[PDB]
């Protein structure tokens, strides 16, 4: 179906301990494919997926150059933001940036993104129109004025509508074995006695890709939204993801409870019950 490409960047200052650390990673959908870490002994952009390995030396040199350039601009920007927020040079601060594109099944641009945060808070974001900005505060308004003067949005839009989508399409074809395969969840329901009077029903989803999934418990057909413990979807470490949902149920009433599972890898949503 639809697909996305995203680049993430984090710079973290560390006064007294050298220059800020810079880490950037690239993803297609939920698959990591490139990384760069300023603290590596000889920092270069490195492949993290088999299908990107075929790109040539020109590709790797250019991507490395771009990451290093972003590290440098971030270092400059961290100094600038200390001024904008009247902050001392003593503390650690963080700049984050994400940008990228979503495409539909037919490969057309659905939406573009470019957004920045300072110290974990929204700073400035490109709007969905890819032509205007939303600034979170009067400091970010200064950046907005500068970026308007430099025609940043126009160049960004050109990238998002152009190379972003074209290279995403390229990666999807080259990596079609994995990028265009959904692995459905393996599901089971386990029962964990708590006391004489009640037990935990845990609905499991294992080994699935991509990460998007819905697990819900029903009692007599009513969603148990408020009484479900739903852990965050977590990486198994081998491309796939895991998740579980749990309900505490009065012993004897186990059959009034149903677990429902929706994943793009399933032709039909699943209905599970504790069986033992």
């Amino acid at each position: 179906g639809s697909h996305s490409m995203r680049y993430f960047h984090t710079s973290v200052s560390r006064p007294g301990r050298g220059e800020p650390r810079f880490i950037t990673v690239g993803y297609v959908d939920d698959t990591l494919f490139v990384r760069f870490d300023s603290d590596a002994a000889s920092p270069r952009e490195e492949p993290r997926a088999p299908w990107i390995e075929q790109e040539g030396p020109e590709y790797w040199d250019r991507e490395t150059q771009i990451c290093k350039a972003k590290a440098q601009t971030d270092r400059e920007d961290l100094r600038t933001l200390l001024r904008y927020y009247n902050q001392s040079e003593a503390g650690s601060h963080t700049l984050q940036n994400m940008y990228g594109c979503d495409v539909g099944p037919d490969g057309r641009l659905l939406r573009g993104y470019h957004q920045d945060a300072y110290d974990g808070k929204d700073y400035i974001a490109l709007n969905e129109d890819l032509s205007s900005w939303t600034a979170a505060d009067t400091a970010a308004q200064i950046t907005q004025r500068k970026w308007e003067a430099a025609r940043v949005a126009e160049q960004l839009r050109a990238y998002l509508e152009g190379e972003c989508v074209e290279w995403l399409r390229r990666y999807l074809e080259n990596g079609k074995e994995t990028l265009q395969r959904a692995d459905p969840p393996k599901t089971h329901v386990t029962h964990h006695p708590i006391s004489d009077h009640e037990a935990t029903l845990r609905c499991w989803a294992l080994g699935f890709y991509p990460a998007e999934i819905t697990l819900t418990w029903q009692r007599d057909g009513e969603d148990q939204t408020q009484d479900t413990e739903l852990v965050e979807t977590r990486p198994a470490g081998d491309r796939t993801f895991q998740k579980w949902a749990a309900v505490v149920v009065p012993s004897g009433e186990e059959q009034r409870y149903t677990c429902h599972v929706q994943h793009e890898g399933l032709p039909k949503p699943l209905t599970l019950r504790w069986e033992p």
Partner: peptide, 10 residues
């Protein structure tokens, strides 16, 4: 494929 822009500062 990363976005290339020159001297983008905040």
């Amino acid at each position: 494929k990363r976005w290339i822009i020159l001297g983008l500062n905040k």
